[PDB]
Design a protein around this ligand. Structure first.
Ligand SMILES: Nc1ncnc2c1ncn2[C@@H]1O[C@H](COP(=O)(O)OP(=O)(O)OP(=O)(O)O)[C@@H](O)[C@H]1O
Ligand SMILES: Nc1ncnc2c1ncn2[C@@H]1O[C@H](COP(=O)(O)OP(=O)(O)O)[C@@H](O)[C@H]1O
Ligand SMILES: [Mg+2]
Ligand SMILES: [Mg+2]
Lengths: 373, 371, 224, 239, 237
């Protein structure tokens, strides 16, 4: 009935769309201008007044100033309708025009595609109150990551240093990534996830660069929350033995540490270090001057298991009444990820029973199956 | 009610568009002349000698375009462009004089897809899969009906399983079931093997892994068939020797791709393993991989079914009886049965008789048995 | 930490920790001491059917005045109990008396301390005995730490049973209250229903010597 | 001498060595045993033998005394050594007391041997699982089983080897005093269990039975043929 | 610290040996025990922990000889072995000479032994720390001994977890020490335990064991009730 009505009406829509296409006719082929008009004569004229090249300014020698510019053609130029002389900066991207080469427009700095898309400006879809079994850990993380930011005058009155650096560690799967996502979503600051694999490249020179540009980007931004993951992958025991050929990763780790805290302030950057094997981590990095508030995620207790159970039960089609504390009791030594998989198994059991209700019986069957496997 | 909404508005579309547009077409003029005017004006917008490479985009109307000589020049784009196709690294078209962005054209990509996607619909289908009904139904539940019927999961609440492991001895139709899933499903299956990702140098393996995952996400919401991984990593060891350390990094990247910080599309992972006890305890984490499936050796009836399905395209003889081969109560995979059939056929061909014989199948049995 | 007997950097021999893990994996047993005696109730792990209850032996007799319950490796308990019985009889031979429960427990623990032997035993024991100071219960762990307790629970359900014991136990009960509460907790924590064949139940009283309850009284208390 | 520790506890709290040993036992041949009122039966797969291979040298079943019989699953040399040890022990027990060794006592000895060899500070734990059947001097159709880990229990029947899992579920099912009433139908149940793995009717199922305090006896192959023939008659009648 | 940290037989490239450091860590993990002394009295006040509300507190004061008592913190197994050893030594010394074994000699012998399995690749240290109160002909003696054998003859010492508060109190009140009655001696030890313990937690007549040795009094153990008068008379906060 309803399904057939759907099929009919969607057939009508497909027919309408093809009819529109054939009747009027809009396509691109190779390049196109489908949006009507788009006349851009003034655009051409101002492009001629512009369409400038860019390079990297080097030095402003004199106090009319002498800007020095380097690309496939060196140059020494200055002056422009632009003001804020060299925007009080030298190593920018100048953006200078042709035709006597003295008119400029400042540009941001070039950055490799890797970091460009590692910026990860997206907001993960997680929020607090969806976390159970690690109330103490989340309390610690909330304190460290928010008190310096949210009404932090109370945090400065006491004359106490602001902690900077937290390493999340624990068994594989405890809601560490979940809590990282939640903090990312809630926070309002330059957030930057980092993947360890992207820091391993073809021979020396790559990781150290990308790390340095990442760090200067964070410094340029007002306040950064960096989110290293795969720290187990990036940075390990400094010992060489046979790693005399593999010293590249160790080198990159060394530069990472130096930028974290070397002979220069590191800045308003708070670091999150995701891991599950917090022993091979190098001592220099693990130094508490760089990872202040290491947090440990443990297997949830009964209350945490129940809270995670109801959280996952947030979904609909579930039974009207379930007895979650017994569910948790039946699943001891179970990760929150295992609670999630138990809810998934209950849903799949409902489907394989052709039932639109997820019953406590379905939950019990799922628990039995997961326990047996 | 929702049906009422969609039907009402859909009829609104048909009526509005069809009637008004057909009125204008009946008075066709005032459209073709304008279209020709616009097309010739676009042509007038310089189309001499022209090409461009897009390093990046500043914002609407402004972007940086680099030429083979490194002509990085920044230019104000011309709105005539198609727009929204300006992904960094795209091949742009630039006016010879003003280097105005007016067009973009790549129409050519890395053939990695064409290499790792061969025979998308192999000759083996579920009919060719003789037996293993339980495993077949479970893998369908895990893979296909989530895609072919994205209604049940959506209405009930959960999302489908992401990673599914198929573990069993060396040869139980794992790749066969992968192929059948590919053929039956409309999605762009992806074959992958564990002996190629082990690259010569650091970062190469994880780089190609990430590229493979991104390709899977982009080109199609499909399956990725990761064959043996025990030759990779085998859990996270003390991480002492450089090669194994790098391979552990490769698995950790795999783990991030399987379930990372950001998100995951509608791409399902299917693992095939000879041995599972040795795999990373963390990788199989129930959040990531679920529905590990035994793929054991066929029993006697499954062996009958496998022989029958293999030999369906095999005109067995009247005297040839396919029970002396079921007689053997030892290791005989589907691959073993195929080898037995092929060896019997080849020996019959060698001994020149067009029709296979029971003795030929017997000899094929002895010469296919390894131990 | 790696190695045979190497001391783990965070303390402990780490084989003690492994032994603790094994004990936790082991089956569940409960012991309760009262002025009227000491009672032991151990859940069994009868495998698939066809199993007579006289197949798994999670309770043993030390002289006519102590019972012992195990959790962990069957043969480990067998060896430790063999040592305990031999030591008890040797002391009786040399003293014309019977050891105190403290003394037998500490002797067995002393033997357990030696890690000849290359690994710690994978069995935790609970001795309910009757000695000069009445009925007492001594819990011994593979590390060798022996302590007398008012009521102890060991095994897979060790923590939950111990919490229930803390809730229910008071300084004043009798053997009857001890046994009924222990059986209630055992049923609540059982792998399946209380079939009267998947348990072993013993008592040592200031009076009747150590006694294994027979099927009749088992089913009686079960229905009670 | 060697004085090197082995059998290290695992992070999980298990012994990698003992789990390896038990799987190595599992990979071997299959053998079932059952007890009656006065008959204790023990059948086992022959595991194939070349037409040139004498069966006398395949002794996967050993009579350790007039009341104890062990069926092996593992390595033949380990079988030989453990068997000889146990039998020297039984004769020693005969010296100690003028009575036959009970199955319970022999099983205790075997379990002690397993414990010694798994925790003797450098040893290779016997990858073996043993099944004993005897009649106490008074007479009791007792049947015991011993795992390679040393843990032993009292069993009214058993089935160990490659098929041990499936045969165990099978025997747990469709087993009752109706089946084990007497020698009658008991060999039939045993043969049905062994044909649970089909197609080996005449190639395997070397069988022995011991009556109450009478003796142990290997079942001759003409008798085996008669039993299997009537059993398949019963089958075809069923279907 | 990769490698160089297995068995005492391996020398680190730092002049350091780390298995001994781990044993000392276990000593700290042990429970609090404070020994102090006057001209004619040595008092060991020790906190027996409570593993479970149904399990009685682990006693940690052992009377080895008439004139010698020990308070232990660490592996109870090694503590028991060492206590057996000192008892055997005291009996042998009494047999050979009808004398109370000198405390210094006894402590030196124990240090020697606990050193012995620190130079062979077959054995381990003894992660047990002892506070010994003895009374020899020279009078009362307070000794501290650790797995390293570095015995220290102290006016007042403290070992086990939270031992630092006891150390602070003893350092502050040394001047009084050696110039106080026996009751004041026990009261000072109790004050040290009170400082060590959490403020909410208080020394009941169940958590404390008091071993007192001195002139005309063999080493006497006070537990359960015998501790009652001292706690009752003790000051509060
Ligand atoms: N406290 C929690 N509240 C809710 N869900 C939780 C919690 N802990 C774990 N989970 C569930 O476990 C999974 C979280 O996996 P996540 O990636 O965050 O873990 P992790 O601790 O970072 O480790 P791993 O990467 O090894 O899985 C999801 O299924 C999440 O639902
Ligand atoms: N239902 C089935 N189960 C197992 N194998 C089958 C089945 N049907 C056919 N086969 C045969 O199994 C072979 C494929 O096994 P494969 O997937 O390569 O095992 P593995 O991946 O473990 O090596 C094919 O040659 C095919 O002919
Ligand atoms: Mg995670
Ligand atoms: Mg395959």
């Amino acid at each position: 009935t309803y399904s057939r009505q759907i099929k009919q009406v969607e057939d009508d829509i497909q027919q309408l769309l093809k009819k529109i296409n054939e009747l009027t006719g809009i396509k691109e082929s190779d390049t196109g201008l489908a949006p009507p008009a788009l006349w851009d004569l003034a655009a051409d004229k101002q492009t001629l007044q512009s369409e400038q090249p860019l390079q990297v300014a080097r030095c402003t020698k004199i106090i009319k100033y002498i800007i020095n510019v380097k690309q496939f053609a060196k140059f020494v130029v200055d002056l422009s309708d632009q003001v804020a002389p060299t925007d009080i900066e030298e190593g920018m991207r100048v953006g200078v025009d042709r035709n006597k080469y003295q008119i400029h427009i400042p540009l941001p700095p070039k950055i490799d595609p890797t970091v460009t898309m590692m910026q990860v400006e997206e907001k993960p879809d997680v929020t607090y109150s969806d976390v159970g079994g690690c109330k103490e850990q989340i309390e610690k993380l909330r304190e460290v990551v928010e008190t310096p930011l949210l009404h932090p005058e109370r945090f400065v009155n006491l004359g106490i240093e602001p902690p900077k650096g937290v390493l999340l560690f624990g068994p594989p799967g405890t809601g560490k990534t979940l809590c990282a996502r939640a903090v990312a979503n809630r926070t309002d600051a330059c957030f930057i996830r980092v993947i360890g694999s992207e820091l391993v490249q073809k021979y020396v020179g790559e990781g150290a660069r990308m790390v340095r540009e990442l760090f200067e980007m964070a410094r340029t931004k007002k306040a950064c929350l960096i989110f290293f993951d795969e720290i187990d992958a990036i940075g390990g025991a400094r010992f060489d033995d046979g790693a005399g050929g593999d010293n590249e990763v160790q080198r990159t780790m060394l530069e990472l540490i130096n930028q974290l805290d070397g002979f220069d302030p590191r800045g308003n950057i708070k670091v999150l270090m995701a891991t599950n094997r917090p022993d091979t981590l190098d001592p220099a990095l693990m130094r508490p001057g760089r990872l202040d508030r290491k947090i440990e995620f443990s297997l949830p207790d009964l209350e945490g298991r129940t809270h995670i159970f109801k959280i996952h039960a947030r979904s609909m089609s579930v039974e009207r009444d379930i007895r979650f504390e017994l569910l948790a009791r039946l699943c001891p030594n179970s990760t929150g990820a295992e609670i999630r998989s138990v809810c998934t198994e209950a849903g799949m059991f409902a489907i394989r029973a052709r039932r639109k209700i997820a019953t406590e019986k379905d939950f019990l069957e799922a628990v039995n199956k997961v326990i047996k496997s | 009610r929702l049906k009422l909404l969609k039907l009402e508005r859909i009829k609104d579309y048909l009526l509005m568009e069809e009637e008004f547009i057909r009125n204008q077409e009946q008075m066709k003029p005032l459209e073709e002349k304008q279209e020709e005017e616009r097309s010739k004006v676009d042509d007038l917008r310089g189309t001499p000698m022209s090409v461009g490479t897009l390093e990046e985009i500043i914002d609407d109307n402004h972007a940086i375009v680099s030429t083979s000589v490194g002509s990085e020049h920044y230019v104000s784009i011309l709105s005539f462009v198609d727009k929204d196709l300006l992904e960094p690294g795209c091949s742009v078209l630039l006016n010879h004089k003003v280097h105005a962005v007016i067009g973009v054209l790549m129409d050519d990509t890395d053939p990695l897809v064409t290499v790792m996607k061969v025979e998308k619909a192999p000759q083996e289908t579920y009919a060719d899969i003789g037996g293993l009904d339980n495993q077949i139904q479970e893998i369908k539940e895990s893979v296909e009906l989530p895609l072919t019927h994205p209604e049940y999961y959506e209405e009930m609440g959960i999302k489908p399983p992401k990673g599914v492991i198929l573990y069993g001895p060396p040869g139980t139709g794992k790749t066969l079931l992968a192929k059948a899933v590919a053929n039956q499903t409309s999605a762009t299956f992806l074959r992958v093997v564990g002996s190629e990702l082990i690259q010569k140098y650091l970062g190469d393996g994880p780089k190609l892994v990430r590229e493979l995952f991104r390709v899977a996400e982009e080109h199609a919401p499909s399956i990725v068939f990761i064959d043996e991984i025990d030759a990779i990593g085998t859990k996270r060891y003390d991480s002492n020797s450089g090669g194994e350390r790098e391979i552990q990094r490769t698995m950790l990247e795999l783990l991030n791709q399987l379930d990372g910080f950001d998100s995951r599309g509608d791409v399902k992972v299917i693992m095939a393993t000879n041995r599972i006890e040795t795999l990373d305890p963390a990788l199989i984490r129930p959040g990531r991989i679920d529905r590990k499936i035994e793929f054991p050796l066929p029993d006697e009836k499954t062996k009958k079914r496998i022989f029958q399905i293999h030999t369906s395209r095999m005109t067995l003889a009247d005297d040839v009886t396919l029970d002396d081969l079921i007689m053997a109560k030892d290791d005989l995979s589907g691959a073993d049965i195929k080898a037995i059939c092929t060896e019997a056929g080849l020996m019959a061909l060698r001994e020149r008789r067009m029709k296979v014989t029971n003795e030929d199948f017997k000899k094929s049995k002895e010469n296919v048995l390894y131990k | 930490d790696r190695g045979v007997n190497t001391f783990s950097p965070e303390g402990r021999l780490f084989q003690v920790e492994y032994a603790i893990e094994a004990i936790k994996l082991g089956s569940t047993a409960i012991g309760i001491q009262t002025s009227e005696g000491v009672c032991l109730a151990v859940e069994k792990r009868i495998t698939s059917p066809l199993m007579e209850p006289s197949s798994i032996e999670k309770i043993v007799e030390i002289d006519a005045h102590i019972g012992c319950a195990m959790s962990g490796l069957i043969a480990d308990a067998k060896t430790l109990i063999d040592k305990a019985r031999v030591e008890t009889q040797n002391h009786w031979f040399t003293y014309n008396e019977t050891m105190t429960v403290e003394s037998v427990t500490q002797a067995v623990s002393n033997l357990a301390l030696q890690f000849a032997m290359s690994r710690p035993f994978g069995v935790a024991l609970l001795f309910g005995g009757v000695d000069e100071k009445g009925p007492q219960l001594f819990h011994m762990d593979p590390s060798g730490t022996f302590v007398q307790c008012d009521a102890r629970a060991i095994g897979s359900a060790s923590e939950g049973a111990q919490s229930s014991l803390q809730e229910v136990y008071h300084k004043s009960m009798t053997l009857k209250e001890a046994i009924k509460s222990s059986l209630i907790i055992l049923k609540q924590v059982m792998e399946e229903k209380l079939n009267a064949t998947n348990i072993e139940l013993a008592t040592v009283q200031p009076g009747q010597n150590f006694h294994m309850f027979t099927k009749e009284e088992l089913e009686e208390v079960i229905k009670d | 001498s060697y004085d090197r520790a082995i059998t290290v506890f695992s992070p999980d709290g298990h012994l990698f060595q003992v789990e390896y040993a038990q799987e190595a036992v599992k990979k071997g041949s299959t053998a079932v045993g059952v007890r009656g009122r006065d008959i204790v039966v023990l059948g086992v797969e022959k595991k194939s033998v070349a037409k040139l291979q004498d069966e006398r040298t395949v002794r996967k079943i050993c009579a350790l005394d007039d009341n104890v019989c062990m069926a092996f699953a593992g390595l033949t040399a380990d079988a030989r050594i453990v068997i000889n040890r146990a039998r020297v022990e039984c004769q020693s027990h005969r010296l100690t007391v003028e009575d036959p060794v009970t199955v319970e006592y022999i099983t205790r000895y075997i379990a002690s041997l397993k414990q010694r060899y798994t925790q003797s500070n450098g040893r290779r734990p016997f990858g073996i699982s043993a099944l004993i059947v005897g009649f106490d001097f008074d007479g009791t159709p007792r049947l015991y089983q011993t795992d390679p880990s040393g843990t032993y229990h009292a069993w009214k029947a058993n089935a160990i080897g490659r098929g041990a899992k499936s045969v165990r579920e099978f025997l747990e099912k469709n087993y009752t005093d109706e089946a084990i009433e007497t020698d009658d139908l008991t060999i039939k149940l045993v043969i049905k269990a062994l044909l649970e793995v089909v197609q080996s009717g005449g190639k395997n199922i070397e069988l022995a039975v011991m009556r109450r305090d009478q003796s142990l006896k290997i079942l001759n192959p003409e008798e085996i043929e008669k039993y299997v023939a009537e059993i398949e008659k019963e089958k075809e009648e069923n279907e | 610290r990769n490698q160089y940290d297995n068995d005492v037989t391996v020398w680190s490239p730092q002049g350091r040996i780390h298995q001994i450091e781990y044993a000392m860590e276990a000593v700290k993990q042990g429970s609090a025990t404070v020994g102090l002394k006057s001209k004619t009295h040595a008092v060991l006040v020790a906190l027996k922990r409570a593993q479970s509300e149904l399990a009685a507190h682990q006693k940690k004061i052992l009377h080895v000889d008439n004139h010698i008592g020990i308070s232990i913190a660490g592996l109870t197994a090694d503590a028991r072995l060492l206590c057996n050893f000192m008892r055997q030594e005291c009996l042998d010394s009494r047999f050979v000479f009808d004398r109370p074994l000198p405390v210094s000699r006894l402590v030196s012998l124990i240090g020697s032994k606990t050193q012995i399995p620190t130079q062979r690749y077959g054995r381990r240290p003894y992660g047990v720390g002892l506070l010994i109160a003895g009374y020899d002909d020279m009078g009362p003696h307070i000794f501290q001994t650790c797995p390293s054998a570095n015995y220290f003859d102290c006016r007042a010492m403290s070992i086990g977890a939270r031992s630092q508060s006891a150390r602070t109190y003893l350092e502050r009140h040394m001047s009084e020490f050696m110039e106080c009655n026996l009751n004041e001696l026990v009261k000072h030890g109790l004050r040290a335990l009170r400082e060590t313990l959490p403020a909410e937690q208080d020394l009941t007549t169940k958590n404390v064991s008091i071993g007192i040795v001195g002139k005309d009094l063999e080493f006497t153990i006070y537990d359960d009730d015998d501790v009652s008068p001292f706690l009752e008379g003790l000051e509060e906060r």
